[PDB]
Design a protein around this ligand. Structure first.
Ligand SMILES: Oc1ccc(/C=C/c2cc(O)cc(O)c2)cc1
Ligand SMILES: Oc1ccc(/C=C/c2cc(O)cc(O)c2)cc1
Lengths: 388, 388
């Protein structure tokens, strides 16, 4: 009768809170210090002698030591079109994407749900964020089946978002959890390189650089407002979440879905673009909270690349350590796109707890989470750590 | 300092409300009573004599009289791969999709914004829902540029959702508008058939049926909680929004993104699946509100096809008229996927007002909005009409 009364009683009351986290990747670990050779070998670009040495240089300064990858030297054999620079292979890539994406996402979810300790039945919303794997019904549908979620879970299929999608989900999860009482949201960001992998091109360097970065791996996050005492354990609270487009950026990061898989460009000016726009976002989100010292807060930045980390650290003037967790994930996993920030969040708390610190935010109270991607989008999420 | 206080002051207070609507389609109107010939002509499937007559039969019982289409007999000439049943054409289709989708979406938005009367600067969120046109940054990015939206508008790129995406956006818009004070959301659902069009196959009937249904057209909807008196005009209020998966449905509606464009299947059992599951959703959403007579409320159903309309009307026992608006849109526009429901909502109020009725819901107070799509998803949105 009263849309006003229904509203008043059906809305959550507190801020969105991260209650559990889970992560998993393809078993196959690929070593970085020997990737340049492996790569030029299975692509048969050995005669590109120069480009090869040049690729080891890249792989070295990569700051990455390991990366999980579904694609194996075997899977690459049965798929010649995927080893070539540009060759019709969209169908093959998508089929691996569609099969493997939900599969790994479920492994991450199970771990998260086990931690959370609650019954799946309680999951009210589902946010599935993947770079690709287009099918109707989508990847989320498969996840519901595999996992056995409720047939009335409200779904949100985020396709082809970009490396900044990490903050996107949190931004979206916030409103879902905070507007509906008992809303418990499941975030699953599964990224797989089956669509971005291809052979080298003497003319396409941007593409050659991505081959040394992108890795595989999923992450499941349980989010919900008004934590049940004792039963549920809050880890972090979503305080605020902004998104922003930097002018003159479209040509920086991007790509298209072609018949030869996902193509992409990464302009060298990225670390700069971020560095020269990162402060405005910082102030925009911490001024309202009286924070001026960006060292008094913990950090979780999307490891788009080492250079980005060096530049932001250099501009904002952060002690080394601030980026220790972030770099730590990059080194053992590489750039799993939207998944990285949650592997870092998981790493931060897991360590803070094994260190005896007073909070999950490296003993600190406030922290910021970034996300960097296409059109040069920046997503600033402000977090509030939880005690003990 | 108090994530509890920030929350208390930054949240909207009333229910999400539709304040303006705008729609636009490709100028090119294609006549249905002569489509079977046109279609078999530009595809060069004239020798398929039987299939051709069979296609006119389909086109006739279609219940569609007109459909706007970007694709012209000229554009089809310069694109032989798109006239063939299955032929590598993903790149061409996507490029039209990417260029035309945002373009038409902006025309719809301008009209909506003009109506709303407020400055664009006030648009806080952007929900872009299209069946395809994959690029990074995505179609939403382009819309921001074309339209001149703020560089900090929170974006939500809904790609490849399905014919049920109409309710999806409303479901999502609700939480956005209702959780953030002053949040004014822009919903743009632009659907274009450049990706689903192809030639006939003596073996692929499901595909032949879609060629007689799918049309072009965009729709922009302004949504926001706590209407400004006099300045803003509320049209409908979002009361509740559920989503549901019918067991044993995946094979009913669906499709994949292939190198030959978007493929799709439409199983004849759909009108049944809906009809035999439509009541549960109805009760689920109207019982809490004491509504038992589904004729005492106005209706806005996704015109997935005439048969679906006939079956639901037959099961629920609705006077003819209940589906008069819905069928009216289908006849002049066809199935523009996620756009249809908003062209119907626009049509309902536009007529109710020119009829002298007391509300925008055909003089009634409550109404329901449906959405039907892949994996056989049903989205039940309950609306509350606005006065005069
Ligand atoms: O598992 C994966 C992890 C990361 C990626 C990379 C995606 C991507 C594609 C682009 O067009 C732009 C880029 O900035 C991001 C692909 C697979
Ligand atoms: O403008 C357009 C309007 C509608 C469509 C149809 C999309 C579609 C594709 C499928 O796999 C399943 C189907 O149920 C829906 C495409 C373009």
């Amino acid at each position: 009768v009263s849309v006003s009364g229904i509203r008043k009683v059906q809305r959550a009351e507190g801020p969105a809170t991260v209650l559990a986290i889970g992560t998993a990747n393809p078993p196959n670990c690929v070593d970085q210090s020997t990737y340049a050779d492996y790569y030029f070998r299975v692509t048969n670009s050995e005669h590109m002698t120069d480009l090869k040495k040049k690729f080891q240089r890249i792989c070295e300064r990569t700051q990455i030591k390991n990366r999980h990858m579904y694609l194996t030297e075997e899977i690459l054999k049965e798929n010649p079109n995927m080893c070539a620079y540009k060759a019709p292979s969209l169908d093959a890539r998508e089929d691996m994407m569609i099969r493997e994406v939900p599969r790994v996402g479920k492994e991450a979810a199970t771990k998260a749900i086990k931690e959370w300790g609650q019954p799946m039945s309680k999951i009210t919303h589902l946010i599935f964020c993947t770079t690709s794997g287009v099918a109707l019904p989508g990847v989320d549908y498969e996840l519901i089946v595999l996992l056995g979620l409720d047939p009335s879970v409200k779904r949100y299929m985020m396709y082809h978002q970009g490396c900044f999608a990490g903050g996107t989900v949190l931004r979206l999860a916030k409103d879902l959890a905070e507007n509906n009482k008992d809303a418990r949201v499941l975030i699953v960001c599964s990224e797989n390189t089956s669509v971005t992998f291809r052979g080298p091109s003497e003319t396409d360097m941007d593409s050659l650089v991505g081959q040394a970065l992108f890795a595989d791996g999923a992450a499941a996050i349980i989010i919900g407002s008004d934590p049940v005492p004792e039963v549920e354990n809050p880890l972090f609270e979503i305080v605020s979440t902004d998104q922003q487009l930097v002018p003159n950026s479209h040509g920086a990061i991007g790509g298209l879905l072609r018949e030869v898989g996902l193509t992409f460009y990464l302009n060298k000016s990225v670390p700069d673009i971020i560095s020269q726009n990162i402060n405005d976002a910082l102030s925009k989100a911490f001024d309202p909270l009286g924070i001026s010292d960006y060292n008094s807060i913990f950090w979780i930045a999307h490891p788009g690349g080492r250079a980005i980390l060096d530049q932001v650290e250099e501009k904002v003037n952060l002690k080394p350590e601030k980026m220790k967790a972030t770099r730590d994930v990059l080194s053992n996993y590489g750039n799993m796109s939207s998944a990285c920030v949650f592997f870092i969040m998981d790493l931060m708390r897991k360590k803070s707890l094994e260190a005896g610190l007073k909070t999950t935010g490296e003993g600190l109270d406030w922290g910021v989470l970034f996300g960097f991607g296409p059109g040069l989008t920046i997503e600033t999420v402000v977090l509030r750590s939880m005690a003990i």
